[PDB]
Design a protein around this nucleic acid. Structure first.
Lengths: 324, 192, 1062
DNA sequence: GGCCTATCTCCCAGCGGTATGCACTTTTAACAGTCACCCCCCAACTAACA
DNA sequence: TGTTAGTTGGGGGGTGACTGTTAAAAGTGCATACCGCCAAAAGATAGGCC
C-alpha cells in the first residue's frame, strides 16, 4: 500500500516546481522515500543535491548504484521519516532512528527560529493514518522536538482531498471545521502547488510492485485526487503566552470546545475556567450568543492569550496532567 | 407594518369559509336564535353532503395554499434576520399574554379569594353615590378628603365592618382551600 | 350594602354549581388535565362491564366479589417498581390515581399487566376498603386478565380483617373449588407476609375449622461419599469452644447492632498532630460555615425537587417521587455530604458516582425497614439462645454444628427485598448527582473575601479524552483541595461493612442469608454474570451445599487480635520519614524533568493514603476481639468481606494479626516454631527438617538480639525475605525459651504449611505421572525437591542455545535469571493464565534490579513466559495431555454457543462469566447523557478466546478449594483452629503435626474418586444428549469421552510423604 | 480448505453529542354579539421570600 | 428580622370570550447512522474472505 513516481514528464515538472530559480541549488533536499528510482534521477538532473531516505532495504542496492561520482550528491541513508524519535520505549530498529544522529551524520547544524530555512523536505503522506501523521507533526512543531529542534523546516508532501478539505476550513463551510484545522492554520502558512489524479502514480505492495490491473479499476472506483501542499512555519507563532510549555492547555481547550459543537463559548468557558466568561468575551470584542463554530482561529488564539495574561487570580485553568 | 401574519391577509380555508359563510345565512333565517343549534345544523349539513364538494374545496384550498406559499416566499425575501428575531420575540410575548389570560380566566371562573374591604373601602362602597363631581376621579378625591376629615368615632363602625368581613373572608378561605383540595388545585394553596 | 351582599351570594351559589358540575363532569378534556386536579377514585368491549354495574352502584359491597362479579418492555418494569414502592411508602391513593389514568388511555392501557393490578389489590387488602377493591376488580375484568391466587388471597385478607359474614366467605370458598387453585398454595411458595397468612387463616378457620398445615419437621442429611463421615452420628467428636463467657458475647452483639444501625464509623487519624495554630483554625472555621450553608441549600433543593416530582406524578406521568420518600431528608443530605467529603482531587466518573449514590440509598432502605418492623427483636432473642453453643460455661445437651443449632431452634424467616431494576437505579443516581452539582456553591476568592462577591460552583463537569472517546468526570475547584489539605482533619470515616465485626458472624444457612447481621451479603462476589451463578445456587438440591456453607461458617468463627508490639514499630517508622524497603511508605513531601517529579509524587501519594487507612483502622481495633466474615467467588476461592483490613496482603498486614485463644506448646511445639522461623528466613530451602532445626539452634543469639532490640541492634531481621513476620517469630521464640517450663506456654502465633505449586501437584495426582509426582513432593524422600530450580535450569539452557543465534533478548538477559522471576512466571503460567496479567508483575522484578537496562523490560517479559511454558511441557507428562483435552473440550463447547459449566466433587456448581459485548443503553438529561451495559442480555454469546484459556486453571482452582474445605471440615472434629490464607494453611504450633496427617489423608480420598471420568459422564448428559443438532454432538462426543490414561504411581505413598506440605 | 488480517495488560468500567426518520396525541386561529381583563391612589394586609 | 407585590373598589376605553367546522402544526418517545483519532512497541493466533 505504497506509491511513488515512475514517469518522466511528471518527474520533470515536479523537479522544476521543487526548486525555484532564486533559491540556492546546494540547499539540501531530503526525499522521504525515493522508491525504486526515476524521481531521484530527475532531481539530480535539476541541479540540486539529494539526501535519500528509504524505508525498505530492498531498494538500497539500486539507490546505491547511482551516484558513482565521489561528489556526495546522492548520500543514501536507510531510515523512515514518520518513525523519527519514537516516543514509545524500545530498541531502535534500523527503520527507526533519532533525528540527532541523522542530522549529525548529514553535517547540518542549528539555526535560530527568526532566520532563514535550513533544509527542504519533499515526500508523501501515508495512505492510512494521515490524521495521526499530522498530529505527530503538530506535536513536534509546537514543542520543538525531533526534526524541528534545528530551525524551521518545510514539508512538501501530498494529501488526499478529504483531509485537505478538513484542513483549511473556516466559518463558511461550517460543517467540517475542527481542531486540527485550527492548530495547522495557526502553526504555519499553507499553499497549494499541484493536483493530480491517483492513476498517474504507480501502486506497490509487500509482495512486489502491485501487479493487479483491476486495482487501477479500484483506483478509478475510488476516484481519489491528490494535492501538493507547502507548509512553511510561521515566524510569530510562539507568542509569550503560547509557548512550548503551554501548548497542551491550548489543545485541551480546542478539543473541549469542538466537543459539543452546538453550544456557545460561555457554556464551555464555565467548565474550562473559574473566571467570568462575559468579561472575556466582551474583552476580545465579541458577543454571548456566538457559537464556537463561527469563531475564527485567531480569536481562539486571542481568547487563550486573554485568559493567560491575567495575573489577578491564582487558578485560571482546570487542566492538570491527571486529565492526560 | 407587522412581521406577524396579522398585517397581511391570510386566506381562510375553503371548507372553513363554507362553515363561516353558512353562519350568517342561518342567522338571517332564524333571527335572535342561539348559534348553538345553527352550528349544529351546519355540521349536520357538512356530514350529510357527499365528498365531491370536499374534493373541489380541497382543490380551491390547494390553489390558495400555492398563492400563500408565494406570498410567504416574497415575504421571506423581504424579511431580515433581525426581523425574524423580532417575530420570535413577538411570538414569545403572545405566548406570555395568552398564558396570563388563561390563568386569570381559571382563577376567575373557579373559586377565587376576594379579600376583605377595609374601612375606607367600605366607606367608598357606601358613600360614593352621595358625593357629587364632574368626573369620577373628582368624586373619589372628595370621598378621600371626607374620609380623612372623619374622626375615629365614626370610623369605629367601619373598622368593625372590616373586621367582620375579614372573619367571613377567613372562613370562606378555609372552606375554599378544603373544596379546592377536593378539586385538586395543588398550585392553589398556601406554600407553607 | 344589601345589593352587594346579594350579588356576592348569587356568584357564590354559581361557584357551588360549578364545583358540583366539576365533581360530576368526567375528566375527559386534556386542557383540564394540564392543570393539577383531584385524585380519581372511580372501549366497545373493554368498557362493557363498567358502563352499567358501576352506574347502579351496589348497596351491599359484599356482592360482586371475585367470580361472582362476572421480558418486559423496560418502561413497564419501572411502573411495577413504582407500585411496589407505593406499597411501602403508604401512598396507595397516588398509585390508584396513576392506575386509573393509565387505564383510561388506549395507548397506556396496553403496557399494564396483572401484577400491577395485584399490587394495588394487595394494598387495599389491608385496611379494609371493600369499595376500592371492587373497583380494581372491575378494572381487571375490563382489561380481560383472568384472576390468580394472589387476588383471591387479597380478598380473603380483606374479609378476614373486616370480619364480615361467614356465609359470604363460605360462598367464596365454594368457588375456587372445581378450579385448580389449591388452598395450601396460598400459604407457601407465594411471597406474602406473615400477617397476610395469619388473616387468611382467620378466614379459613371460620369457614373450615379442620384446616391444618403440614409441619415438615425433620431436616435431611447430606449422606454423600466424601461427606458421610462429617455428618455421621456414630463417632467421637470434641468440638471447640470460645474462651469468653456468655455475658461478654451478649454485650458484644449490642455493640455490633449499634454500629450497624448507623451506617458510619469514625476513626482517629494516626497522622502527626498539628496542635500549634499555623492558621489551621481559620481553615477549620471556614470549612464549618461552608458546610452548614451547603446543608441548608441541599435541604431546600430536595424539597423543591419533591414538590415538582409530585406534580409530575399527577397529570399521569411516571417519576421518582416514592423513591425519595423512602428515607428521611436528613439522611439523604448526610449521605450526599459524606460522598462529597470522600472525593479525590483528580475526580471520578459521573456513572461511578451515580451508581455509588444508588447502592447506598438501597442499603439504608433495607436496614431501616427492619427497624420499622419487628425483626430486630427476634434476631436478638435467637442470637442470645444461639450463643450457648459457641461459648464457655454454657452447655448444650447434644453436640452439633452451629448451622444445625441455628435451624433446630425456631428461626425467623428474615425476608428481604428483591433488588430494583437497573434503569431506576441509574436515574436515581443521576438525579442525586445533578442535585449535588447544582446545589453546592462556593466563594471565588478565599484569601480576600471582602474584595470579591462572585459565587462559583464547587464541582465542575469536564471531559477527559482518550483515543476517540471522551469521559465526563467531575472535578473539584483547586482552592477547595488546597483548603482541605491546609486544614488537618483528625477523623476518617468508614462504612460499617468495611470494618471487622465485633461479634461472632451470623451462620451461613442460605445463599442469601449470611454473614452480616442486618446488611445483605451474597455468597458469590461476581459482577459479571451475577444472576446466573445465583440461579444455579438456588436451583440445586438443598443438601448439596452444606460442606461449603459449613466451611465458610468455620472460617468466619475464628477469633483475632492485634499484635501491638509490631504496631508500635510500624507507626514509629510511619510518623517519621520512614523506610521504604521494608514496606512503610515515605511521605510525598520528602520526595522531589517536570513530568517525572509530578508523577513520582503522585504514586507515593496514592500509596500513603491506603497505608494511613490501614494503620488507623488497626489502631482503632488495638484492644478488642474481632471476627472476619468470608465468602467465595465463582471458582471457589475464599476471600474475606472487608476490602482493606483483611488478613491477606503484605508482610505488615500479617505481622499485626494473631489468634485470641491460646493452646499450650506441648512437647514438640517449640521445634515447629524454630522451623517456621527458618522457613520465613528464606535460607536453607533445600535442606531436611533437622538441618533447619540445627541452624535455628546456631542462630539463637541472633534471634534473641533481634527480639530484645529490634531497631537499635544488629538488624538481622531486615536481611530476611519477609522481615516483620521474622521479627514476630523472633519475639515468640524468645518468650518461649526464656520461660521456666518450655512446655505449658500458651502461644497465639499461627504456623504456616504450603505446597510449592498445588497446580502441578493436582496435575501429577490426576495423571498418576511418576516423574511429576517425584518432582513435586508426592514420593517419600529424605531431601526436599524444588521445581523452580529445574525450571530455571531448563530456561537457562534454552536461552544459552538461543543466544548463539544472535537474538538480542537472549544475550541481554545474562546473570539475570533468578528464582524469583521463575517463580512469578510459573505462577502466571499455571494459575491465572486467563488473559495473561501477571506479566505486569513479571515486569516489576525485571524493573526492580538495577543492573538491567530498563527500556528492554517490555520485550523481556513476553520472552520469558514462552520459555517457561516450553519448560513445563518438557518436564511434565500428564500436564500436556490434560491441558490439551480441557482446551479442546472448551473450544468445542464454546463453538456450539454454550458457556462452560461443571460440578465440583463437593456439589458446588461452577459456570464461567465470559461473554461478548452487550447492548449499551443511554439516559438523557440536563448535564450529560450516560451510557451503561445492561446485564442479563439474551443476545450475549460466548467469547471463545476467554472460554478456552480459562478452563484449565479454573478446574485446578476448584480442586484447591475442595481440598481445603475437606481439610477444614475434618480438622473441626478434632478440636483444631484452621485458617486458609492464599495458598497457605495456618494452625497453632501444637497441632501442626496432626493437621499434617489429615491434609494428607483427604488428598488420598479426593483423588481416589474418578474426578476426570465423572466429568466424562456428566458433560455428555449436560451437553451431548440433545437431538436438536447432532452434527457437532457426534464430533464432541468422542473428545468428551477421551480421558487420558493414568500412569504408574501409588497414591497411598503420599500418606508417608514428609515434605508434601512443608 | 487455505490466505491473509487484526489483536494483546485493570477487569474494571462503562463514551458522549448531532442530525434524521417515524408511529401517535392535541391543539389553535379563523368569524361575531356581549360581558370579563386592566388601569388609579387611598390605605391596609400579609403571605411569601431572603 | 427586613423586603417584595398583588389584591380589595373607582369608572371610560379597547380587547377577548361562548357558541362551533378545518385540517395542519406540534410535540413525544423511541431507533439508529456517523463524526471525533488527543502520539506512541513485537509474534502468534484465530477468524474472515476468496
Amino acid at each position: 500500500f505504497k506509491r511513488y513516481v515512475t514517469d518522466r514528464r511528471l518527474a520533470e515538472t515536479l523537479a522544476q516546481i521543487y526548486l525555484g530559480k532564486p533559491s540556492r541549488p546546494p540547499h539540501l533536499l531530503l526525499e522521504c522515500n525515493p522508491g525504486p528510482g526515476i524521481l531521484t534521477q530527475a532531481l539530480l538532473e535539476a541541479g540540486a543535491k539529494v539526501v535519500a531516505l528509504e524505508s525498505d532495504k530492498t531498494f538500497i542496492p539500486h539507490l546505491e548504484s547511482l551516484g558513482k561520482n565521489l561528489d556526495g550528491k546522492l548520500r543514501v541513508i536507510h531510515c523512515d521519516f514518520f518513525k523519527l524519535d519514537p516516543r514509545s520505549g524500545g530498541v531502535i530498529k534500523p527503520p527507526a532512528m533519532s533525528s540527532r544522529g541523522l542530522f549529525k551524520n548529514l553535517g547540518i547544524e542549528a539555526v535560530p527560529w527568526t532566520a532563514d530555512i535550513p533544509l527542504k523536505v519533499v515526500g508523501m503522506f501515508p495512505s492510512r493514518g494521515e490524521k495521526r501523521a499530522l498530529w505527530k507533526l503538530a506535536y513536534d512543531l509546537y514543542s520543538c522536538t525531533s526534526i524541528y529542534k534545528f530551525g524551521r523546516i518545510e514539508v512538501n508532501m501530498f494529501i488526499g482531498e478529504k483531509e485537505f478539505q478538513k484542513l483549511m476550513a473556516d466559518p463558511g463551510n461550517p460543517d467540517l471545521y475542527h481542531v486540527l484545522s485550527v492548530i495547522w492554520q495557526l502553526a504555519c502558512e499553507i499553499k497549494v502547488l499541484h493536483m493530480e489524479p491517483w492513476s498517474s502514480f504507480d501502486i506497490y505492495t509487500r509482495k512486489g510492485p502491485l501487479e493487479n490491473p483491476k486495482r487501477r479499476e479500484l483506483l478509478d472506483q475510488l476516484q481519489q485526487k491528490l494535492y501538493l501542499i507547502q507548509m512553511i512555519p510561521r515566524q510569530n507563532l510562539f507568542t509569550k503566552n503560547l509557548t512550548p510549555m503551554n501548548y497542551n492547555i491550548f489543545f485541551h481547550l480546542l478539543k473541549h470546545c469542538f466537543g459539543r459543537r452546538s453550544a456557545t463559548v460561555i457554556d464551555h468557558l464555565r467548565s474550562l475556567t473559574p473566571l467570568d466568561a462575559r468579561d472575556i468575551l466582551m474583552q476580545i470584542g465579541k458577543q454571548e450568543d456566538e457559537k464556537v463554530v463561527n469563531m475564527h482561529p485567531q480569536d481562539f488564539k486571542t481568547l487563550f492569550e486573554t485568559i493567560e495574561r491575567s495575573k489577578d487570580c491564582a487558578y485560571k485553568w482546570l487542566y492538570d496532567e491527571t486529565l492526560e | 407594518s407587522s412581521v406577524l401574519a396579522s398585517s397581511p391577509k391570510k386566506p381562510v380555508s375553503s371548507y372553513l369559509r363554507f362553515s363561516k359563510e353558512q353562519l350568517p345565512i342561518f342567522k338571517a333565517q332564524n333571527p335572535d336564535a342561539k348559534t348553538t343549534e345553527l352550528i349544529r345544523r351546519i355540521a349536520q349539513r357538512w356530514r350529510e353532503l357527499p365528498d365531491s364538494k370536499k374534493k373541489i374545496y380541497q382543490d380551491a384550498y390547494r390553489a390558495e395554499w400555492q398563492v400563500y406559499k408565494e406570498e410567504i416566499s416574497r415575504f421571506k425575501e423581504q424579511l431580515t434576520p433581525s426581523q425574524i428575531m423580532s417575530l420570535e420575540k413577538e411570538i414569545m410575548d403572545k405566548h406570555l399574554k395568552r398564558k396570563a389570560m388563561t390563568k386569570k380566566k381559571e382563577l376567575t371562573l373557579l373559586g377565587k379569594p376576594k379579600r376583605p374591604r377595609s374601612a375606607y373601602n367600605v366607606y367608598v362602597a357606601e358613600r360614593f353615590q352621595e358625593a357629587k363631581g364632574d368626573s369620577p376621579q373628582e368624586k373619589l378625591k372628595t370621598v378621600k378628603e371626607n374620609w380623612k376629615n372623619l374622626s375615629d368615632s365614626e370610623k369605629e363602625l367601619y373598622i368593625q365592618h372590616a373586621k367582620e368581613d375579614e372573619t367571613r373572608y377567613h372562613n370562606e378561605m378555609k372552606s375554599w382551600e378544603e373544596q379546592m383540595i377536593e378539586v385538586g388545585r395543588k398550585d392553589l394553596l398556601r406554600r407553607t | 350594602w344589601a345589593k352587594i351582599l346579594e350579588k356576592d351570594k348569587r356568584t357564590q351559589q354559581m361557584r357551588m354549581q360549578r364545583l358540583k358540575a366539576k365533581l360530576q363532569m368526567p375528566f375527559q378534556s386534556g386542557e383540564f388535565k394540564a392543570l393539577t386536579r383531584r385524585l380519581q377514585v372511580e372501549s366497545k368491549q373493554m368498557a362493557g362491564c363498567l358502563e352499567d354495574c358501576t352506574r347502579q352502584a351496589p348497596e351491599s359491597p359484599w356482592e360482586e366479589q371475585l367470580a361472582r362479579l362476572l421480558q418486559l418492555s423496560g418502561q413497564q418494569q419501572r411502573l411495577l417498581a413504582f407500585f411496589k414502592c407505593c406499597l411501602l411508602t403508604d401512598q396507595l391513593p397516588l398509585a390508584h390515581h396513576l392506575l386509573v389514568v393509565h387505564h383510561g388511555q388506549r395507548q397506556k392501557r396496553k403496557l399494564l399487566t396483572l401484577d400491577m393490578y395485584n399490587a394495588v389489590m394487595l394494598g387495599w387488602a389491608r385496611q379494609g376498603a371493600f369499595k376500592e377493591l371492587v373497583y380494581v376488580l372491575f378494572m381487571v375484568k375490563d382489561a380481560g386478565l383472568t384472576p390468580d391466587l394472589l387476588s383471591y388471597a387479597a380478598a380473603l385478607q380483606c374479609m378476614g380483617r373486616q370480619d364480615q359474614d361467614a356465609g359470604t366467605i363460605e360462598r367464596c370458598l365454594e368457588q375456587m373449588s372445581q378450579e385448580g387453585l389449591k388452598l395450601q398454595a396460598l400459604f407457601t411458595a407465594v411471597l406474602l407476609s406473615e400477617e397476610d397468612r395469619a388473616t387468611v387463616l382467620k378466614a379459613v378457620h371460620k369457614v373450615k375449622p379442620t384446616f391444618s398445615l403440614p409441619p415438615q419437621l425433620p431436616p435431611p442429611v447430606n449422606t454423600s461419599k466424601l461427606l458421610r463421615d462429617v455428618y455421621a452420628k456414630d463417632g467421637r467428636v470434641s468440638y471447640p469452644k470460645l474462651h469468653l463467657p456468655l455475658k461478654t458475647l451478649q454485650c458484644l452483639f449490642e455493640k455490633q447492632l449499634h454500629m450497624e444501625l448507623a451506617s458510619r464509623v469514625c476513626v482517629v487519624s494516626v497522622e502527626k498532630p498539628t496542635l500549634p495554630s499555623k492558621e489551621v483554625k481559620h481553615a477549620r472555621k471556614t470549612l464549618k460555615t461552608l458546610r452548614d450553608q451547603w446543608e441548608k441549600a441541599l435541604c431546600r433543593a430536595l424539597r423543591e425537587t419533591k414538590n415538582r416530582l409530585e406534580r409530575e406524578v399527577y397529570e399521569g406521568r411516571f417519576s421518582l417521587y416514592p423513591f425519595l420518600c423512602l428515607l428521611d431528608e436528613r439522611e439523604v443530605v448526610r449521605m450526599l455530604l459524606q460522598v462529597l467529603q470522600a472525593l479525590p482531587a483528580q475526580g471520578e466518573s459521573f456513572t461511578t458516582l451515580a451508581r455509588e449514590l444508588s447502592a447506598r440509598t438501597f442499603s439504608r432502605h433495607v436496614v431501616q425497614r427492619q427497624r420499622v418492623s419487628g425483626q430486630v427483636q427476634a434476631l436478638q432473642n435467637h442470637y442470645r439462645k444461639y450463643l450457648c453453643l459457641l461459648a464457655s460455661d454454657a452447655e448444650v445437651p447434644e453436640p452439633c454444628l452451629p448451622r444445625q443449632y441455628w435451624e433446630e431452634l425456631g428461626a425467623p424467616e428474615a425476608l428481604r427485598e428483591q433488588p430494583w431494576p437497573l434503569p431506576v437505579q441509574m436515574e436515581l443516581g443521576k438525579l442525586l448527582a445533578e442535585m449535588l452539582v447544582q446545589a453546592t456553591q462556593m466563594p471565588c476568592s478565599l484569601d480576600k473575601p471582602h474584595r470579591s462577591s462572585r459565587l462559583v460552583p464547587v464541582l465542575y463537569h469536564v471531559y477527559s479524552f482518550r483515543n476517540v472517546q471522551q469521559i465526563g468526570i467531575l472535578k473539584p475547584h483547586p482552592a477547595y483541595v488546597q483548603l482541605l489539605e491546609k486544614a488537618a482533619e483528625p477523623t476518617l470515616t468508614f462504612e460499617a461493612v468495611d470494618v471487622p465485626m465485633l461479634c461472632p458472624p451470623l451462620p451461613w444457612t442460605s445463599p442469601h442469608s449470611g454473614a452480616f447481621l442486618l446488611s445483605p451479603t451474597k455468597l458469590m462476589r461476581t459482577v459479571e454474570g451475577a444472576t446466573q451463578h445465583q440461579e444455579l445456587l438456588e436451583t440445586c438440591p438443598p443438601t448439596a451445599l452444606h460442606g461449603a456453607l459449613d466451611a465458610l461458617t468455620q472460617l468466619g468463627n475464628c477469633a483475632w487480635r492485634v499484635n501491638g508490639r509490631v504496631l508500635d514499630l510500624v507507626l514509629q517508622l510511619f510518623q517519621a520519614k520512614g523506610c521504604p524497603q521494608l514496606g512503610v511508605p515515605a511521605p510525598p513531601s520528602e520526595a522531589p524533568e517536570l513530568a517525572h517529579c509530578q508523577k513520582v509524587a503522585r504514586e507515593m501519594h496514592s500509596l500513603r493514603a491506603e497505608a494511613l487507612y490501614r494503620l488507623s483502622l488497626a489502631q482503632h481495633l488495638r484492644d478488642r476481639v474481632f471476627w472476619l466474615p468470608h465468602n467465595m467467588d465463582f471458582r471457589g476461592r475464599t476471600y474475606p468481606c472487608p476490602p482493606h483490613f483483611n488478613h491477606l496482603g503484605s508482610d505488615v498486614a500479617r505481622a499485626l494479626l494473631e489468634f485470641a485463644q491460646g493452646r499450650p506448646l506441648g512437647p514438640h511445639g517449640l521445634d515447629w516454631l524454630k522451623i517456621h522461623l527458618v522457613n520465613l528466613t528464606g535460607l536453607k530451602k533445600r535442606e531436611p527438617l533437622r538441618k533447619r532445626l540445627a541452624f535455628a539452634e546456631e542462630v539463637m543469639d541472633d534471634i534473641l538480639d533481634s527480639a530484645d532490640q529490634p531497631l537499635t541492634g544488629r538488624k538481622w531481621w531486615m536481611g530476611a525475605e519477609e522481615p516483620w513476620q521474622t521479627l514476630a517469630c523472633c519475639m515468640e521464640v524468645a518468650n518461649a525459651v526464656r520461660a521456666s517450663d518450655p512446655a505449658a506456654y500458651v502461644s497465639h502465633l499461627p504456623v504456616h504449611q504450603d505446597g510449592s505449586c498445588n497446580g502441578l501437584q493436582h496435575y501429577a495426582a490426576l495423571g498418576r505421572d511418576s516423574v511429576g509426582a517425584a518432582s513435586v513432593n508426592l514420593e517419600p524422600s529424605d531431601v526436599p525437591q524444588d521445581v523452580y530450580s529445574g525450571v530455571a535450569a531448563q530456561v537457562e539452557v534454552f536461552r544459552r542455545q538461543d543466544a548463539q543465534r544472535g537474538m538480542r533478548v537472549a544475550q541481554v538477559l545474562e546473570g539475570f535469571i533468578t528464582r524469583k522471576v521463575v517463580k512469578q512466571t510459573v505462577m502466571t503460567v499455571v494459575y491465572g493464565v486467563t488473559r495473561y496479567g501477571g506479566r505486569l508483575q513479571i515486569e516489576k522484578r525485571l524493573r526492580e534490579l538495577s543492573d538491567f537496562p530498563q527500556e528492554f523490560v517490555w520485550e523481556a517479559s513476553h520472552y520469558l513466559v514462552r520459555q517457561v511454558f516450553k519448560s513445563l511441557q518438557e518436564m511434565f507428562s500428564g500436564t500436556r495431555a490434560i491441558q490439551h483435552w480441557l482446551t479442546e473440550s472448551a473450544r468445542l463447547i464454546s463453538h456450539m454457543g454454550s458457556v462452560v459449566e461443571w460440578v465440583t466433587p463437593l456439589g458446588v456448581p461452577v459456570i464461567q462469566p465470559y461473554r461478548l459485548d452487550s447492548k449499551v443503553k443511554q439516559i438523557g438529561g440536563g448535564i450529560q447523557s450516560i451510557t451503561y451495559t445492561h446485564n442479563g442480555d439474551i443476545s450475549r454469546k460466548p467469547n471463545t478466546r476467554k472460554q478456552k484459556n480459562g478452563f484449565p486453571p479454573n478446574f485446578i482452582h476448584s480442586l484447591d478449594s475442595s481440598h481445603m474445605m475437606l481439610t477444614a471440615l475434618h480438622c473441626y472434629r478434632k478440636g483444631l483452629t484452621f485458617v486458609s490464607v492464599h495458598d497457605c494453611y495456618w494452625t497453632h504450633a501444637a497441632d501442626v503435626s496432626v493437621m499434617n496427617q489429615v491434609c494428607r489423608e483427604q488428598f488420598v480420598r479426593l483423588h481416589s474418586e474418578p474426578i476426570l471420568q465423572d466429568l466424562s459422564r456428566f458433560l455428555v448428559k449436560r451437553f451431548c444428549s440433545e437431538p436438536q443438532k447432532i452434527l457437532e454432538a457426534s464430533q464432541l462426543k468422542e473428545t468428551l469421552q477421551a480421558v487420558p490414561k493414568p500412569g504408574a504411581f501409588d497414591l497411598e505413598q503420599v500418606k508417608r510423604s514428609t515434605y508434601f506440605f512443608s
